[PDB]
Amino acid sequence: EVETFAFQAEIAQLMSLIINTFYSNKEIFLRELISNSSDALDKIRYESLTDPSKLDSGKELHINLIPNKQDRTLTIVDTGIGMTKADLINNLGTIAKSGTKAFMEALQAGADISMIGQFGVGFYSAYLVAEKVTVITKHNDDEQYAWESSAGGSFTVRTDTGEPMGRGTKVILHLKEDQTEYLEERRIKEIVKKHSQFIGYPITLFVE
Amino acid sequence: EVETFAFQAEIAQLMSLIINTFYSNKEIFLRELISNSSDALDKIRYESLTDPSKLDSGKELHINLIPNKQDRTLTIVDTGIGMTKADLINNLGTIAKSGTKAFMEALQAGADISMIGQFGVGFYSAYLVAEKVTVITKHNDDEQYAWESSAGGSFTVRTDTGEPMGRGTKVILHLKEDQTEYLEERRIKEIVKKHSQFIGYPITLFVE
Numbered sequence A, B: 001e002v003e004t005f006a007f008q009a010e011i012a013q014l015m016s017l018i019i020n021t022f023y024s025n026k027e028i029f030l031r032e033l034i035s036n037s038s039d040a041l042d043k044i045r046y047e048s049l050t051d052p053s054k055l056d057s058g059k060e061l062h063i064n065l066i067p068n069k070q071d072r073t074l075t076i077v078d079t080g081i082g083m084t085k086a087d088l089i090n091n092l093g094t095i096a097k098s099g100t101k102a103f104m105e106a107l108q109a110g111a112d113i114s115m116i117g118q119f120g121v122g123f124y125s126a127y128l129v130a131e132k133v134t135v136i137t138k139h140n141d142d143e144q145y146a147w148e149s150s151a152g153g154s155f156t157v158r159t160d161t162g163e164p165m166g167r168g169t170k171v172i173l174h175l176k177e178d179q180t181e182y183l184e185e186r187r188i189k190e191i192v193k194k195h196s197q198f199i200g201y202p203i204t205l206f207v208e
């Protein structure tokens, strides 16, 4: 069921930088994950213009934010294009390599962590607040998969057997013990309002 | 040879807003067109990861900025994914409709013109400085096309017979008489430095 993979060494060191650097403006994680969901939703939307059947796995284009204090998770759910297995294992890592290097150059040169999205690697900002990230995803062409990593240089992929999700991606943030402020309705709302206010898809912030 | 099309009424009114509103910070046009080229280059790059032959029409992934004082044009050239005929005539217009409406709502509500890129319609910022825009583009699946518009509610498309470009998109800005500062090497460099400094593709600013 479970395959284990090594991050390429550059992503590994980016993840450790994110995890070990002292940086108090952690909230930008949420903007990066939302902006990712928006791009994925733009992508399936555009694709559907030439192949309307690509929306057979779900017509609604949206983003949901789901805090769970019991599990201490914040989940970002979209009905975007999703990721194939090849994306999870390979394509996105290839992509992340030059973005990482550029970002890592920019930082030595005085850029700061909040600029991570400009380098195509904003997903890894999840590790500002999350000790473990689980990503469930479903692309029209492929099976539903669960990717997961607590950093430390590796990650897993397995075919997923929880609730079928139709199409999209769900990012589950297992929050660090000191980052539970991001389970709070008021804190989430404050962040979405500040950083994500012009996203062209409804964002629903679920309550508990 | 030449087909003439009407903009949908919402894009028409956006273009007139861009053309008639008093707004002195015109330089952001260049950031929007560069950011467009970057996304198009990300797109062909990603596609090539699963189909390396998509790079048979050119391996180099780059952006060139070409001022021409004699013709009074500034051209932004990329070797990105390019646009099919259906994109030019249809797909991009469909896309632009909700971005426009959202942007136009945001403006009534106090947002300003520089935020146009957040709504997916930054291309039309070209009309801050250009009395006419000509776009030459070539997608792997299709022929080379020339799109063109001086606004006033319509646009043309024709198959293009100038130099074959292999793959990509060239945006030719016929500048308004009072906007020739954007032909100046120093002004362009100043703008790219300010707004476009972390683009992950070489940007070459040609001199005359």
Ligand SMILES: Cc1ccc(CNc2cc(Cl)nc(N)n2)cc1
Residues within 6 Å of the ligand: A036, A037, A040, A078, A080, A081, A082, A083, A092, A093, A095, A096, A120, A121, A122, A123, A124, A169
């Ligand atoms: C480098 C890198 C870029 C992007 C990711 C995650 N990307 C995605 C991809 C999709 Cl289809 N949907 C969402 N929400 N996120 C992971 C790594």
Ligand SMILES: Cc1ccc(CNc2cc(Cl)nc(N)n2)cc1
Residues within 6 Å of the ligand: B036, B037, B040, B078, B080, B081, B082, B083, B092, B093, B095, B096, B120, B121, B122, B123, B124, B169
């Ligand atoms: C709404 C709207 C969005 C985008 C455009 C132009 N888009 C593109 C498309 C491509 Cl493939 N390359 C570049 N450089 N620009 C035109 C209109």
